[PDB]
Amino acid sequence: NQALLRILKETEFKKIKVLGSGAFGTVYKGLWIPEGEKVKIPVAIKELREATSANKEILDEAYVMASVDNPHVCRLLGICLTSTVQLIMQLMPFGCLLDYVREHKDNIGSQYLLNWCVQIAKGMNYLEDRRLVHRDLAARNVLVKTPQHVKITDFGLVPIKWMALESILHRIYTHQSDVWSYGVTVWELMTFGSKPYDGIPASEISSILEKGERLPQPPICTIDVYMIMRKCWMIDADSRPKFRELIIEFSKMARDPQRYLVIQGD
């Protein structure tokens, strides 16, 4: 347990290049140089903006994020605590899945898309088995280790357009509210990275959902696939599919991909 999270010294890692920066902090590509070893490991390093307060909460959560053990869930490798918090995990060389499907929209076939749906459902099922609620599942929070190996990140940390109605209205987050976000994530993949409810203010989302409107059927999706997405967006959270059922359904479709997704040049 405790040995799953490495407490790193500033000597043990070096930031080499900027991968991205934003309100959250800065993510770097860098090297992990563990003391007493003769290897330099390429990693991603995230430096959080300085916290005013306490610091214990960040460390407590870090121990949890270091304990995950699933091929489709990112694991926290190490942490360095100074004036700032610095977080180290394996580099995902291909970036986030949302950008990946946008950049390769013309070269992605039905098998890739359905395999991603399986892998994301497997990671979410694992998090549910560990009693962890993600709360922020979106295509931007799936990272691409290799084109057919993706991993969920940033679980346990307002994304109105991905939230289930009960989360918007009542601040209720459960595994079933994650299923709703899974449905939106699948919609992003099937539209090759379109923005959900594009051009609609976030403040209007609750009313259009209350009105019974949902994201439209993607052109490539047959009715069998769209019906699964639609069930993820049922108002009754108990009526949504469970991640265990989604694994089975998408695994079945991945066995015959061309039957379930209609893509030009597939």
Ligand X SMILES: *CCC(=O)Nc1cccc(Nc2nc(Nc3ccc(OCCOC)cc3)ncc2F)c1
Map the footprint of ligand X across residues 10-39, applying CB under 6 A: 19-20, 27
Cβ closer to ligand 57N: 88 or 229? 88
Q: How far is the CB of 265 from ligand 57N (least distance, A)?
A: 35
Cβ closer to ligand X: 29 or 230? 29
CA atoms of 156 and 135, how far apart (whole Å): 7
Which span sits near ligand 57N by CB under 6 A: 40-48, 190-198, 233-241, 245-253? 40-48
Residue 157 lies near ligand 57N (rule: CB under 6 A): yes
Burial class (CB in 10 A: 0-12, 13-18, 19+), 173: middle
Q: Characterize the bridge pairing of strands 13-21 and 41-48.
A: unpaired
Residue for token digits 């995902």?
92
Query: Is 136 considered catalytic here?
Result: yes
- Of these, 8, 66, 77, 96, which contacts ligand X (CB under 6 A)? 96
- Of these, 5, 8, 44, 124, which contacts ligand X (CB under 6 A)? 44
User: Taking a C-beta distance cutoff of 8 angstroms, is the pair 82, 122 a contact?
Assistant: no
Residue 92 lies near ligand X (rule: CB under 6 A): yes
Residue 6 lies near ligand 57N (rule: CB under 6 A): no
User: Taking a C-beta distance cutoff of 8 angstroms, is the pair 161, 197 a contact?
Assistant: yes
- Of these, 91, 108, 189, 209, which contacts ligand X (CB under 6 A)? 91
Cβ closer to ligand X: 157 or 227? 157
Cβ closer to ligand 57N: 62 or 246? 62
User: Taking a C-beta distance cutoff of 8 angstroms, is the pair 30, 86 a contact?
Assistant: no
Instruction: Provide the 10 A C-beta neighbour count for residue 163.
Output: 24
Q: Which does 253 bind (CB under 5 to 8 A by kind): ligand 57N, ligand X, none?
A: none
Q: Characterize the bridge pairing of strands 6-7 and 78-81.
A: parallel
Residue 125 lies near ligand 57N (rule: CB under 6 A): no
Q: How far is the CB of 90 from ligand 57N (least distance, A)?
A: 9
CA atoms of 218 and 189, how far apart (whole Å): 10
CA atoms of 144 and 103, how far apart (whole Å): 13
Q: How far is the CB of 193 from ligand X (least distance, A)?
A: 9
Residue type, 28: Y
Cβ closer to ligand 57N: 74 or 209? 74
Cβ closer to ligand X: 91 or 179? 91
SS3 70: coil
Q: Characterize the bridge pairing of strands 25-32 and 41-48.
A: antiparallel
User: Taking a C-beta distance cutoff of 8 angstroms, is the pair 221, 161 a contact?
Assistant: no
State the catalytic residue, choosing from 60, 99, 106, 136. Answer: 136
242 Cβ partners below 8 Å, 6+ apart?
175, 179
Residue ranges in contact with ligand 57N by CB under 6 A:
27, 44-46, 58, 61-62, 65, 74, 76, 87-89, 153-155, 157
Active site residues: 136
Residue ranges in contact with ligand X by CB under 6 A:
19-20, 27, 44, 89, 91-93, 95-96, 98-99, 140, 143
